[PDB]
RNA sequence: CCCGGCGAGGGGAGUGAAAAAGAACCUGAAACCGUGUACGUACAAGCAGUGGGAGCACGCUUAGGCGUGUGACUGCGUACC
RNA sequence: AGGACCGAACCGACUAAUGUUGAAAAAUUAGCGGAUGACUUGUGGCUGGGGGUGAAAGGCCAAUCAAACCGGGAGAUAGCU
RNA sequence: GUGAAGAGGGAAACAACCCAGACCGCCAGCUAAGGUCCCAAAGUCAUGGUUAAGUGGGAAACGCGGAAGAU
RNA sequence: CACAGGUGGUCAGGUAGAGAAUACCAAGGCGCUUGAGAGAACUCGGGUGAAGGAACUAGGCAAAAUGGUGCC
RNA sequence: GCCAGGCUGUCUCCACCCGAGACUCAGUGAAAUUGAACUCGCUGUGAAGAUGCAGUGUACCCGCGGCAAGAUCUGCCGUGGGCGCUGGAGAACUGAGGGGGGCUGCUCCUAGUACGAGAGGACCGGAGUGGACGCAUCACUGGUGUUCGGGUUGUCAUGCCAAUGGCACUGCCCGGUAGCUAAAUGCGGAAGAGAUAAGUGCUGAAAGCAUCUAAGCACGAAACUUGCCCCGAGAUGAGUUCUCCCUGACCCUUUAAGGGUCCUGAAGGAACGUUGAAGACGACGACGUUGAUAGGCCGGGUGUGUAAGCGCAGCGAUGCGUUGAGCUAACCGGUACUAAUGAACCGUGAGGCUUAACCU
């Protein structure tokens, strides 16, 4: 047990975690910046980077697959049009995380996560 | 007689000509050069210190760098000792290959078992305590194939330690 | 790593044909009798294929005397001599563990006709 | 492999159909018996007339195992079910001259030289 | 007036004999909780004290071996009703 | 038409577990039983304490009943701690 | 006779076993029971005898034996 | 006690449904007052599993298999 | 009321996976008990099993998780913080001592051999092969693998068809990546050595015989210990070996294991990040731009199975070539594309007294 296993627990229902990650990815795409806890931020990056990598290639099947794990037509439309060409040269590492201290509400560590370009 | 320190890589099956499948665990055996020699007159017993691997100069402590410089060899990833069998001695910097095991046919493997968390009374003795990360030896194992030019050793059965762990292979005392 | 991959691949013979699951196949097996060795022919249907490098093994099932006997043949073991496909089938299922209960017409499969 | 109180298929013309295990021999404090081991089984159904009568208790040996056995080359022989043939402490030669289904090659034991001849289908 | 959050609370100034009288307001003790000061303790076994007791700091007759703060070690010591 | 059957709501604690601190001074989860009959409940009134009530277990009558709470006889009484 | 209602010393510990009846203080000397290898204060003291088994340092009846005692 | 408990009656949609039971949705109300962490042994509620369905237990007590229409 | 049968981890043996507690981080937080505690084992005694009395032995101080033999305390396993081994620091080991088990069946040759009138019949314990225990492992046998893929009933939603996503135990099933797993496979109960009971013995009287012993003086049971592995210098008796670092100045006093000030900050560690087949929290391992430590990317591999769209056929279900295609978490070889920045803190500045041998 605990040997060579991926995926932090984030104690919750599996479908609940999947919906949580869908919402996280949608928010990050919409606003290009999130202010969230590091334990969740790591898996948010791991789950969102595949979406942007897939969006870099334009095709009906790719768009349908992106919408399947996104469930937001506007967000999917935002993909394949701005993020894809913006990061076309770069291969991987589309997100950066900067620590901003510990959350005052419950001392929970929190950090900003944003795209490499983030503007322009 | 004298054992060598190697690195576990994995284990698979080896097919014989007659059509028999034999489990084999794979040990990479780098040339374990000797750094220091212990003697009865000075150290109180006969032994030779073996080192293997490579450590980055930045991540090597200055005392260890000086010790290896005195030994006149590059710094390895660790130091180990082996009691001599009252045979011919060795010299500092004398690289030792796997050829010693090419004509033994019986070796023993010592290593650290894979770590595990707290274990219950049933899980331990069928009280609770730490599991794994403890020295353990399995004896009376016969070498299958030896590849000196590839630093590859195949030994029957299973040996303590998962992939990437360091182990010691010594001539089988029991026979 | 590289060493284990090299060790596994150096003992690979490019002679086994690519047979789909559920495809009737014959296998030649060396068997030791007395002080000699001889050939044995085993006809059956491949149920599952687990091609883990040189550990590749496939399960072949046969009906003898009214009972079903299934044996796992190693793809690259010296014991296995050659693999020949006689009757070609086509099932859209990697594993055929379901047919253990079927018999007669139900257990039969249709021709691929590819 | 066979455990205590397990049904074994009948592979002989003795007329037996269902046989139940009662005791396991072949090693002190043994929990399982292999294909090449002697086991103690009884009879649940018997033919109206014959040499086998209901309730008799006698030795037997498993010819086929559901779990199966391994081979030196890594091959495994697996059968659809467990099959056993009754054996007697005296006159080991079983009454049945015909055996259902194939048999494996581990029956080369000293006392099993007379059974390899039967079972023509391997 | 300032810190503080345009709070609570605190620090200055003033009044006030006195704020060591601030609305929790005469006098303010122990159980309980903290800082600093001086000493003992991480090789040392039991009603945790009693005599001996070197050592560790202060002031004294400016030594003359005095008292206060602690007690390493040591003989003895099996609570109250 | 059912002391009729399965099965909601509803009712009973018949059984198992949660606790005798407690969420509850008799409650919670689950199972089980009735679920047109011998049923239940919304609202109001009556049966008062050697009395009422009771298919009799001498059961119940506001923390209990087998003599309830209140104030008094009584700061009671014999032995004993 | 002791405890009850009397301390203290010895018997390794111990209330009924031996010496012995505490007015208080003193860094003084002499004794009773018990000791004088040490632990711990005193003779490794003297003379005449037993002991070879640690019996001393646990044991009866009986022909040194009997003899087997408590993590 | 903002407690987990009891509190009398009425309003009673759509889909697949014999059904006011069953599962998702309409309008409406809510995420229930500690959150986040690698996710150990162990406890509680569950799922799968090779040789078996009663060989543990005084005990088929939990769980598990089927859950109908017309005919031969 | 009883019988026959199918039917599940109730069990041999349990293995794995999903949730709430169990452990840490920020805050709230009460109880039963409480004479005081600097709360050890054994032996003897005791109003009679003594943590407290006499004798003896062990134990550095203080914390965290359970096993409950008596969850406050005594006690056990594992693991931590402080402290000393005498200038400091990083590694490697000797080892006083400590954990445990030393089981057992069948067959083969020996061998139908010695011995034995015949009948009868081994020592052998040499080889192979089982049973039970422990350790090791997932390539093989499979189980698990709700994070991967596919089939499928109902319902809602994406403006509608197609195609997709949520809910209904993972909605119900069929397979399965990596990890873990026994039912799977590798090894061990050594050989040899010391002392040995009984027993087997060279010469041998006292007591011209005899005798294991009086003199010279030899083997030996599966019984015991080493030999087999593991922890171990907190072994305070604090060990042995290697290497590295510091080579400044000044003032005062109660003038010495004295104090103070400026400068210096060495090796190493801790601090924080990526994190791991290390882990409850600690601790441990690899790396921190002089890089493959984590993520993503490329290609491969495994798994699942012929994705959507396109055009043809059936006026419809649906099939056909595209297509052994699409997707693929934890596996493998590369890739700095992203995250591990320059730094700050502790840790010092030649190491106390005495003795004996050396060049002075």
Residue numbers in the entry:
A (entry chain N): 1 to 120
B (entry chain D): 1 to 126, 161 to 209
C (entry chain P): 1 to 114
D (entry chain K): 1 to 122
Quote the authors verbatim.
Separation of cellular extracts derived from cells exposed to Api137 in a sucrose gradient reveals elevated levels of partially assembled and not fully matured precursors of the 50S subunit (pre-50S). These data suggest a second mechanism for Api137, wherein it disrupts 50S subunit assembly by inducing the formation of misfolded precursor particles potentially incapable of evolving into active ribosomes, suggesting a bactericidal mechanism.
To elucidate the underlying molecular defects leading to the accumulation of precursor particles, the most immature states from the Api137 data set (d126_(L29)-/(L22)- & C_(L22)-) and the control data set (C_L2) were compared. Importantly, the absence of uL22 was consistently observed in most identified precursors (states: 1-8), implying a systematic effect of Api137 on ribosome assembly. The absence of uL22 and bL32 in several states of the Api137 dataset also led to the absence of uL2 in eight precursor states (states 1-8), suggesting a possible role of uL2 as a checkpoint protein, whose binding completes a construction phase. Treatment of E. coli cells with Api137 disrupts 50S subunit assembly, leading to the accumulation of precursors lacking density for uL22, akin to an uL22 knockout. The fragmented cryo-EM density in states C_(L22)- and C_(L22)- ~ H61 suggests that the presence of Api137 may interfere with the binding of uL22 and uL29, potentially explaining the defects observed in the L22- route.
